[PDB]
Structures are given as structure tokens and as C-alpha cells.
């Protein structure tokens, strides 16, 4: 029931993801070193990690079938609002339920709740973020489903500032229908049970995390002394 077009969409998104996500973590050495001891000792490092990841997200989004037909303004709006959400999704790959941390290849680059706290965040964000990573892990998504969910996240019509909401929606709907059909034809039960609805709930969860993250970000970037330790790309995309 998966058309040639739908199978093409999946192969494109899979390749786009393979070309833009590095599970070897080879670049983490390029980042300002992580500091654990502490007034925001982990902010420079994780700011760099995020800035690096924003660049990966942009590269993925450009390869989403249809994305490039939007106004420059609308591509920008969708990436600005989605970037943190997609990075949270992306990060599930290094998240381990063994100890509820993001484990990126080594000890220096294994991040837990206290590291995220040392980046300026409170439990208001960190607790639901962990709960999110756990719930997402528990879905045990196919990689096919993972990349579709990321693409659907980016092309949402209700994003703030969206101009051509009509065109954004048609782009998304084609992806949504690809995902729904994929699960039916390709995800065997019981894992498939309500899987689509569950995945959309993770996008609602992401909207909520986006909102809290923005609050804590404005509070963090309120003092220029902290704003100083971010990167130019982070300041541009998350605001300042």
C-alpha cells in the first residue's frame, strides 16, 4: 500500500539523515571543553553542541521533499521554531535508559541531568525532557519512522510566523500519509498499536518542551554575560 512515491520519500529522508547525523561523534573535540565541578560550567560546550546540531538540522531540512518550495521567510520560520525540537528528537539516538543520560562515545561527552542543569536549565525543563526521551525510546521506532517524524516536526503549518500555511500543510500531509501507511504496511503488531497517534503525541510533547525551553533560554540569555558564551548561530536562531 506504500506507493513508489512514498517509498521514495522514505529513502530520501533516510539518506538525508545518514548524511547529517554522526553517531561516531567525531567532531565533539571541536567544541569548547565540557566543565564539570559551577556557574554554567557546561554552557559553552553544550552551546557549541547545539550550534553544531542546528547546522545538521538545516542540512536535513533542505532535503525534505517539498521544503525548498517554501518562501525563504517560511523555511527560516520553520527552522527557527523547530530546531530545538528536532535536536531533542535527534538526541534520542545517544540517550540511554541504562542511566538516563545522553552518552556520546566517551565519559567527557556523556551528559546527565546535572550537566544540563549546569547549562542554565531547571527541572521544569529537564524532568519532562528526560520523560520525553524515555517515552520516545519505549516506542522503539524504526529508523524510517524516526526520520519521517523529524520531517513532520519541521514542516508544521501552525508554527509562529508562518506565511503560506496552506503550502506548509500539503508538504506535511504528504509526509504524514507516508508515515501512516508505513506503519500499517511495515510495522508489525503489537508495536504498531496506536503508533501513529503515539508519535503525534510526541510532537505535542515537543511543542511543550519548546515552550519551556524558550522561557529558560530568555532567562539565561537575559544577562549578556551568559549570552556571551553562546554562538552567533544559536543567538540568531533562538533569538536575543
Amino acid at each position: 500500500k506504500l506507493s513508489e512515491e512514498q517509498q521514495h520519500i522514505i529513502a530520501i529522508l533516510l539518506d538525508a539523515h545518514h548524511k547529517t547525523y554522526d553517531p561516531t561523534y567525531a567532531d565533539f573535540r571541536d567544541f569548547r571543553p565540557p566543565v564539570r565541578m559551577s556557574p554554567l560550567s557546561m554552557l559553552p560546550h553544550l552551546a557549541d553542541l547545539v550550534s553544531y546540531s542546528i547546522q545538521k538540522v538545516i542540512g536535513f531540512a533542505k532535503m525534505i521533499p517539498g521544503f525548498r518550495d517554501l518562501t525563504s521567510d517560511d523555511q527560516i520560520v520553520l527552522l527557527k521554531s523547530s530546531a530545538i525540537e528536532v535536536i531533542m528528537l535527534l538526541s534520542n539516538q545517544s540517550f540511554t535508559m541504562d542511566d538516563m543520560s545522553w552518552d556520546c562515545g566517551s565519559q567527557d561527552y556523556k551528559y546527565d541531568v546535572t550537566d544540563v542543569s549546569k547549562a542554565g536549565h531547571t527541572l521544569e525543563l529537564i524532568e519532562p525532557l528526560i520523560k520525553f526521551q524515555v517515552g520516545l525510546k519505549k516506542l522503539n521506532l524504526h529508523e524510517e519512522e524516526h526520520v519521517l517524524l523529524m520531517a513532520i516536526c519541521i514542516v508544521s503549518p501552525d508554527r509562529p510566523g508562518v506565511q503560506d500555511a496552506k503550502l506548509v500543510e500539503a508538504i506535511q500531509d504528504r509526509l504524514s500519509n507516508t508515515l501512516q501507511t508505513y506503519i500499517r504496511c511495515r510495522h508489525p503488531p503489537p508495536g504498531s498499536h496506536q503508533l501513529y497517534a503515539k508519535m503525534i503525541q510526541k510532537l505535542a510533547d515537543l511543542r511543550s518542551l519548546n515552550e519551556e525551553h524558550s522561557k529558560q533560554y530568555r532567562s539565561l540569555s537575559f544577562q549578556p554575560e551568559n549570552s556571551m558564551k553562546l554562538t552567533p548561530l544559536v543567538l540568531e536562531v533562538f533569538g536575543n
Binding site: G59, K62, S72, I76, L79, K80, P232, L233, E236, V237
Partner: peptide, 11 residues
């Protein structure tokens, strides 16, 4: 619009 780096990365 006043996102130089974002726009350049998207081109």
C-alpha cells in the same frame, strides 16, 4: 529576514 546565517545555510 535578519537571519543572515540561517538564510546562507539554506541557500
Amino acid at each position: 529576514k535578519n537571519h543572515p546565517m540561517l538564510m546562507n545555510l539554506l541557500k
